[PDB]
Structures are given as C-alpha cells and as structure tokens.
Ligand binder design. Structure first.
Ligand SMILES: *[B]([O])([O])[C]([C][C])[N]S(=O)(=O)[C]C1=[C]C(C([O])=O)=[C][C]=[C]1
Length: 244
C-alpha cells in the first residue's frame, strides 16, 4: 500500500541522516530503480575500489592464478590494518577486503592478461593503465553505479564470460548477511586514495523463492564515518522496499 513517494522519501532520508550524498540503484528483472539523496550519481564514474575484488577473483580463478583453498601467507610486514596481518584464502580476503592479497593475485595475473580480461568483461571504462597492482584504487579504472548494478546482475545470474564454476566460487565468497529467509551477497568498497572518497556496496538479495534482486549503493565517505553506514543504509532501503 505504500506510495512510491513515501518509499522515495524514506530512502532519501537514510542518506540525509547519515550526512552523506549517495544513491542506491535496484534492479528488478530488466528495470532499474534509483533512490537516495543524490540521484545524479547514478551515471557518474567513480573508482571501483574494493568492489573490483569480485572481478579480480573471477579473473584469477579462471586463469589458474589461485585456487579457492590456497592460503596467501602474510609476509610479516606491518599492514595498514592489523586484521590483515594473517594468512587468508581469497574468500577470507574478500570478507576482510584485504588489499594485499588481491594485489598479489593481480601481480600473478600480470598487466597484459589483466587488461585483456577487464576489456573482455567490459567492466566500467575498461582502462587499467600501467600499474597492475593499484588501478582499481586510484584510477584510471572507473565505473558508474548503473554499471555496478548491471555487473552484479550478470554475476548473480551466471551471465559473465567465465565458467559457471568460477562464478559460483566467487559468489560463495560474497555472502554477507542472512535475514529471515533472504540472503544478501555483496562487496563493499571504500576508495580512500581518491578525493572525494567513494563508498560502495554492490551485490544482490537472493529471496527464499530464488529470485535475485541486484543493487548498488554509492555514496561519499566523510571524515569519521563508519564503514557500516554503507550496510545500514542498504539494509534499511531493501527493507523499506520489501525486498528483505
Ligand atoms: B577497499 O575496501 O575499497 C580497500 C581498497 C580501496 N579499501 S581501504 O584499504 O583503503 C580501507 C578499507 C575499507 C574496507 C571496506 O569495508 O570497504 C575494509 C578494509 C579497509
């Protein structure tokens, strides 16, 4: 019974109250819906930041640069965050957003193959530049929220150009929340190497009946915001729309 005006006002208020500017794009079948407090962000380009780990993992597994059980050993050097000072599989590194592990994977893939594969998937502006280990953090690779939700839609439905098994293995790494009978698969991003900083949460809800509803949240991370605001706004928005 809830009007579209009320859903739009509610979701906008979640971004307003977090003192940020952002959008969340929802896709139902082929139809995009855009909510939030800065709708024009929907077709603007931002660095993908750690959302690129979804594609990095697909590329590295497909090309035999790692297995899902391989343990990437911590090299013993101090990390930016202490939670990264440990040995990790790709899936554990996905959950911790452990940049160093995915930088190792990118170096195994190498610039030539990485560029070919990013072009082959047609991800964002497709440009990785000359540095195989940081192009998703500081540019030149960029992507819009519409492109991110369409990438999530492709992955959720096994439509990316990788083996089915590769896509299933990466999707298993993305389960972040179980709500009643729904499952939320997503990857966060926080681009601290750019100004303004960008925050992302891109993924999909798998409902109990099996329908998959992709989404992409994109906002501005401000001084002293918590990363959990990305999750909190996303979950509140999905709940307001009755998706979870
Ligand atoms: B990534 O998560 O976006 C990674 C590389 C840009 N972000 S970071 O290392 O600069 C800060 C960070 C963010 C997150 C997150 O949840 O996205 C997790 C750990 C560290």
């Amino acid at each position: 019974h809830i009007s579209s005006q009320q859903h739009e006002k509610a979701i906008k208020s979640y971004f307003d109250e977090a003192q940020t500017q952002g959008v969340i794009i929802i896709k139902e079948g082929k139809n995009l819906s855009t909510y939030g407090n800065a709708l024009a962000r929907a077709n603007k380009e931002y660095v993908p930041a750690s959302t690129f780990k979804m594609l990095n993992a697909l590329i590295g597994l497909e090309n035999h640069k790692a297995t899902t059980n391989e343990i990437f050993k911590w090299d013993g050097k101090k990390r930016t965050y202490p939670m990264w000072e440990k040995d990790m599989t790709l899936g554990e590194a996905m959950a911790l957003s452990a940049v160093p592990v995915y930088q190792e994977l990118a170096r195994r893939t190498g610039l030539e193959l990485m560029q070919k594969e990013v072009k082959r998937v047609n991800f964002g502006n497709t440009n990785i530049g000359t540095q195989v280990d940081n192009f998703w953090l500081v540019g030149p690779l960029k992507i819009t929220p519409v492109q991110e939700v369409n990438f999530a839609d492709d992955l959720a439905h096994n439509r990316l150009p990788f083996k089915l098994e590769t896509q299933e293995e990466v999707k298993k790494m993305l389960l972040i929340k179980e709500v009643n009978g729904s499952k939320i698969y997503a990857k966060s991003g926080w681009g601290m190497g750019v100004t303004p900083q960008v925050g992302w949460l891109t993924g999909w809800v798998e409902q109990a009946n099996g329908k998959k509803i992709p989404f992409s949240l994109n906002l501005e991370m401000k001084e002293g915001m918590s990363g959990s605001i990305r999750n909190e706004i996303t979950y509140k928005s999905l709940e307001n729309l009755g998706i979870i």
